[PDB]
């Protein structure tokens, strides 16, 4: 896999944003995990999360998979790094994300995520509070 350059368009919720890239702007939805809506539990404190990490970041990027590149809704499917940080990887560290979603051919960080996850199970940190 391989990191490509985006910017920053708007915030939108814990796993949702709009980036420009190359040149267009697009929602992503971040793969692999799944966080609460903003209407639910930790949803506000997931949406700020990501809000904070995206819009802090000099460089925003994202790497697709080896499959689908965008979803049935037409977003997106990407891991999104915020000056080298995964997002998806840091939401699920908090306990802000579950890992979900996990599609085969596009899984690439899912044993990554899989040891984050269980790092913020064992703190009972946030959803596993
Ligand atoms: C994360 C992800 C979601 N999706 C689809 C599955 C779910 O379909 P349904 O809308 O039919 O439930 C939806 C979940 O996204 P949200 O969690 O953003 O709602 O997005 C993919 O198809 N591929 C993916 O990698
Ligand atoms: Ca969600």
Not at 12 to 32: A, C
């Amino acid at each position: 896999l391989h990191k490509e350059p985006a910017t920053l368009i708007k915030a939108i919720d814990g796993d949702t944003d709009k980036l420009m890239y190359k040149g267009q702007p697009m929602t992503f939805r971040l793969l692999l995990v799944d966080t609460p809506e903003f209407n639910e539990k930790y949803g506000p404190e997931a949406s700020a999360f990501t809000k904070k990490m995206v819009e802090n970041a000099k460089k925003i990027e994202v790497e697709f998979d080896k499959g689908q590149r965008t979803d049935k809704y037409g977003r997106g499917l990407a891991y999104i790094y915020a000056d080298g940080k995964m997002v998806n990887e840091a939401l699920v560290r908090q306990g802000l994300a579950k890992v979900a979603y996990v599609y085969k051919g596009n899984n690439t960080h899912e044993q990554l995520l899989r040891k984050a996850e269980a790092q913020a199970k064992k703190e009972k940190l946030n959803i596993w509070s």
